Design a protein around this nucleic acid. Structure first.
Ligand SMILES: [Ca+2]
Ligand SMILES: [Ca+2]
Lengths: 237, 229
DNA sequence: AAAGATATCTT
DNA sequence: AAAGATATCTT
């Protein structure tokens, strides 16, 4: 499948290469800082050619957002079937020590999942899968080409997984003012395996479509999956 | 001085990719998210070089949502610290200049050292003009750059601050909306840093609230006449 | 505009 | 946890 091939190619590339700096055309190399804003940019850039290669191998077109502030990082589709599009989005978080619990912010809950054309490259309904490539890294002068192995890398270990967004979605927000879905707070294994909390993608969608932006508003409705299932039991009242 | 040396070093000092230790190069994306990361990484060695030359220790933040990107100080003068923060935008200008509800209202909020320890707050602002999914080999000249040209300036934060917010839910100060030249020259709107700070320390978050207080510099000045009521 | 998206972190 | 910072762009 595209999905096993992509997984395999990402896992592989991640093991065979370590990014250590940005290079100028004149050949000066600048090292990397160890902030997730640097590492998410790097990981996104490192992934693009792999997605592209595996996509070509299966006849999919890859499109990236033309405008900024649009989901997804990559839309793949076969020209023959334009309405069965796949959304791939890259997410990153850090760990201080391998094997700690991690969590991701999984995108806004008030944009495309509530309004089919808000902040998304194609209408939401044209997508049949939303995959998350998640990167987890353990956080840890200019140089010349002759020094590539000498530059200190700003991370100790990097792990990557591909999983469906609904599968790893949690029931608490990942951010307040920017209203993001929070993922499960779990070990890396759990993301790989897909040990989430929702039973279907329909349940995930109904929960985040009806989630209220503040706890004073949520106090009356639901604040987690068990209160949501009770709320549903009783007739959404 | 440190400031003229840094400005000279920045003007004096073109990135086309990230490189792996194995020598494969991955090209650069087009979003400002990519380029803000690149211009910060580009400036760190410059800043550190100049700083060293003038006897200043440079410190980056440990926590990821703290200001500033670089704190510079002589260990002999620790309440004469300098804040340098890198800001980026594109042209096919205005900058967002940081929150107005964190350290300017609360001395230790989201800042590496207490706000009172800093004697200057410089902005290095990069402006790039907007214009591959293959990897390259150490082919550098064949790699497409995602930008057509880049300009940089160093200026004091108060001189280029505007009077309209630069963002809504993340409550940022907006700069003057001006030509590159005006930022270089420092053709701002506030009379002093004292006025810049009092305007932003009392700026209300929404238009509702603002409509009974002030929305721009003329209205703030009239609010001062009124007795800050 | 002014308001709210894009992504992730900190307490 | 919930809420609000970090940076910048879009409508
Ligand atoms: Ca994305
Ligand atoms: Ca900064």
């Amino acid at each position: 499948s595209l999905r096993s091939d992509l997984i395999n190619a990402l896992y592989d590339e991640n093991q065979k290469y370590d990014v250590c700096g940005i290079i100028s055309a004149e050949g000066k190399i600048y090292p990397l800082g160890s902030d997730t804003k640097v590492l998410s940019t790097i990981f996104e850039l490192f992934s693009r050619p792999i997605i592209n290669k595996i996509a070509e191998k299966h006849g999919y077109i890859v499109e990236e957002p033309k405008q900024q502030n649009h989901y997804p990082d990559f839309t793949l589709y076969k020209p023959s079937e334009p309405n069965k599009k796949i959304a791939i989005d890259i997410k990153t978080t850090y760990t201080n020590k391998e094997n700690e619990k991690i969590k991701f912010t999984l995108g806004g809950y008030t944009s495309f999942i509530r309004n089919n054309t808000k902040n998304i490259v194609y209408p939401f309904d044209q997508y049949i899968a939303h995959w998350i490539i998640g990167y987890v890294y353990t956080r840890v002068k200019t140089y010349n080409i002759n020094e590539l192995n000498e530059i200190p890398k700003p991370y100790k270990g990097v792990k990557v997984f591909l999983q469906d967004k609904w599968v790893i979605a949690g029931d608490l927000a990942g951010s307040g003012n920017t209203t993001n879905i929070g993922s499960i707070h779990a070990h890396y294994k759990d993301f790989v395996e897909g040990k989430g909390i929702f039973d279907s993608e329909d349940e995930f969608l109904d929960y985040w479509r009806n989630y209220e932006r503040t706890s004073q508003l949520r106090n009356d409705k639901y604040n987690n999956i068990s209160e949501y299932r009770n709320w549903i039991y009783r007739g959404r009242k």
